[PDB]
Amino acid sequence: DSQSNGLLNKELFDKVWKRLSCKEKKSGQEILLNNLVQFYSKDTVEFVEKNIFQKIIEFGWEYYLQNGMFWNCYCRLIYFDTSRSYLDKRQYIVRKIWPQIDKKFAQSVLPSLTEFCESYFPEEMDTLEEMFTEEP
Amino acid sequence: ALRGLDTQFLQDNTALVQAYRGLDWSDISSLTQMVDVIEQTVVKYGNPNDSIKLALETILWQILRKYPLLFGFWKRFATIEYQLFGLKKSIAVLATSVKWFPTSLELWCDYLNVLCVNNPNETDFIRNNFEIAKDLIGKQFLSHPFWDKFIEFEVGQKNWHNVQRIYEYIIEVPLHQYARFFTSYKKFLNEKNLKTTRNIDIVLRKTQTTVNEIWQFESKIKQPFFNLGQVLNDDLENWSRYLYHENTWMMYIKWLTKKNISDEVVVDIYQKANTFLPLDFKTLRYDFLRFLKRKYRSNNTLFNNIFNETVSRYLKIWPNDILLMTEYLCMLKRHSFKNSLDQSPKEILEKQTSFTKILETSITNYINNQIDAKVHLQTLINDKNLSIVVVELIKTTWLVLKNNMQTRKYFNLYQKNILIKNSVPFWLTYYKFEKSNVNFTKLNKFIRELGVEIYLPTTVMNDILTDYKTFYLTHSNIVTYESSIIDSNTFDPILYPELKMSNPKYDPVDWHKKTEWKEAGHIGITTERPQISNSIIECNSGTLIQKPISLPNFRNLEKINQVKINDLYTEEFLKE
Amino acid sequence: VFIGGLSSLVTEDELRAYFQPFGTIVYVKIPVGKCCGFVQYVDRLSAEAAIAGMQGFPIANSRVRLSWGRSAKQTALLQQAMLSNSLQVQQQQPGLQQPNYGYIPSSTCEANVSSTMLPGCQILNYSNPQQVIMQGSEAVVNSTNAMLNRLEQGSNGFMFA
């Protein structure tokens, strides 16, 4: 659909990934994340979700799991994708992103994820509040 | 505003009824009308308030005399002077008497009995009780007054051990251990009270307020919280607040939230701080809104109605504020149209289309100036807050129902309205929409128009130009850029955002009479400066020798002393 | 600056959003319904840039009138001494007690420091409301990160400014 491959050229994405790998020592990680989620397509978003976000989960790095901007961006990638309908993007977010965030991190992740769920999913706000209620 | 003149007018109108010696039904109702206008305007301190209750009682208006007492209790929490009078009256009453007399007594006992100066209130109820022949009821008030740290506690103890000749020490051990434990607390409390009793002196200073010791007293009753505390810190806040200070309210609410009483008590305190506090504080109010959102999960139906009446009352007083409108609309989408993932999808999609339908009929109703007060959203729309409703309609039409044709039709319709052509979330939603589709034609036409015909705040224009340059550099190639360059506007999306940042009014492409020349060295102060008409200082001296130089022509030689000032400040604001 | 001719439908935060990128800003109080405001900057240079750049720009569809104008204290002083019409004399605004070496005027920073204090950089700055901060290294990261925050929250409606 006539899309120039932006940051995800294999010569530039290595320069991105060697800086995302340093994880707190280098400043400005959030802007690299936030500039890698504007693709809004099928296979482009599928590349981004298969290569950065899934791999940060797979390594289990604590800086990005701790940080609420990471999960806000990983929701905002899928939700602005114009290849899915409403039901499958909402069900994908609530069923397979939000379970993965660890409950010990919820005090930092919930203030950033709450603004997302309050802006775009006011109906599914009670599910997110009951996933992180103070009593299990 | 003039609380002194409102004090003076009631002091003058009462002195007109009193010295003309008549009932004076004009001035009787005028002093009552001056009382009603004052009490609605001012919280009416109990010492001033008592005279109004005394005069109406002197005018024998029993049903109205009871109702002003309830208002007095709301106005002053430490109003034991109004509490005792309301207990002194309503004993001269009808058949409901015996039940009402204890009802006002027990309501004051939950209001004032934990105060150090509360010894008169229990004694008066004891006086009411001793006038009855319910010596069992007199005995119950005796044991309760023994257990609370009061002024004349030892005086009460010895007196109750002689008047009760029939049943004095049926349980010696229980009564004296409660009395001595009361004496342990009152010995403790004597440190703070005497530190308060030696500072309160009206000299129009911080000692009359006793705020340092009141913050000391409230602090030391917070930590040693032996469960009288929540009543005690209420009693501690009551004497400290009466001496408007919203920070004291925030500390009392923070302590009471940490103490975990039932939430309706907290809602009562929140409503009282909403009522008696002055407007524009804007910090405990949004605290109340987010408490109503957080506690919504426990009990469903009544908190929606508390929330709804709160947001309506806060668009009464801050109509220019917009976070209330989107907050109301978030709660409306959650409560009224709720549908989980587990439900079948036609139900979900019909609830979304119902929400789009009510929202569109709301804004279409308000633009064409026909109102429908049955639906609460129709009432809540204000023209400062209309734009966020249009934004919710756009974002719901585009991101949920997912039709781009209908979304573009709404953009092309509503960007021509007066109220929302200069709104920030409408245009910034438009930017996110025409960024989602990756086309640059609408984005170049948008940011080429961003200063001249779409007026946004300069912080938002700077944010849009920075993010659009960052977006264009990473999503567009040279073959698109070199065909995007047109010369009549000298527009180029790489460099034009770098020049248009801080100055909004930027046109891209007889000098001596512009308003940049005339006030050159000094802004605002305009002076036509003298200059030579045909100056030769640009001409080199290698070319001045070729032909002889003419005489100078002058312009503006009359005005080396005239300097003139457009003083907007004095004219439009000092002299109105 | 005296900003005159306001719509009266404009708040103080929305008025801070216009006049902030010209330079750092001590206060932005506006009277209740006189249809005119008051903005005060730290720098004379930034205030002159604001009068140049924002002259006649429409805030909520009314062409605005920018000029000079005193504070709130001096305005109360002139109002009572004009109702008594005695003198109405003003007082000069306080100086920066120069030579001052850290500060490069008309500059904004929004939020451990081992800076090499060299000339091209900036060393000291006024904090945004107020106090004085040693300028850190990472100004652009905090600034760009806050504007991405401001875009994503302003599109949904949590700040009209």
Description:
This is part of a larger assembly, with chains A (136 residues), B (576 residues) and C (161 residues). With 136 residues, chain A is mainly α. Chain A has helices at residues 12-20, 30-34, 43-59, 62-66, 68-79, 86-96, 106-120, 125-131. With 576 residues, chain B is mainly alpha-helical. In chain C, 29% of the residues lie in helices and 11% in strands. Chain C has helices at 12-19, 44-53, 73-83, 139-156, and strands at 2-4, 25-27, 40-41, 65-67, 124-126, 132-134. In chain C, the strands form 3 sheets. A two-stranded antiparallel ribbon of chain C has the order 1-4. Chain C has a two-stranded antiparallel ribbon with strand order 2-3. A two-stranded antiparallel sheet of chain C has the order 5-6. In chain C, a hairpin with a 5-residue loop joins strand 5 and strand 6. Chain C is flat. The chains are: A mainly alpha (136), B mainly alpha (576), C alpha+beta (161). At the B-C interface, helix 18, helix 21, helix 23, helix 25 and helix 28 of B face helix 1, helix 2, helix 3 and helix 4 of C. The PDB classes it as rna binding protein. Keywords: pre-mRNA splicing, spliceosome, E complex.
Number of strands of chain A: 0
Query: Tally of extended strands of chain B?
Result: 4
Widest sheet of chain B: strand order? 1-4
**Ends distance of chain A:** 47 Å
Total of helices of chain B: 28
Indicate the structural class of chain A.
mainly alpha
State the shape of chain A: globular
Helix content of chain A: 55-70%
- H/E order of the elements of chain A? HHHHHHHH
Radius of gyration of chain B, in angstroms, nearest whole number: 37 Å
Beginning-to-end CA distance, first to last residue of chain B: 21 Å
PDB class: rna binding protein
Keywords: pre-mRNA splicing, spliceosome, E complex
Entry title: S. cerevisiae spliceosomal E complex (UBC4)
Chain A: U1 small nuclear ribonucleoprotein component PRP42
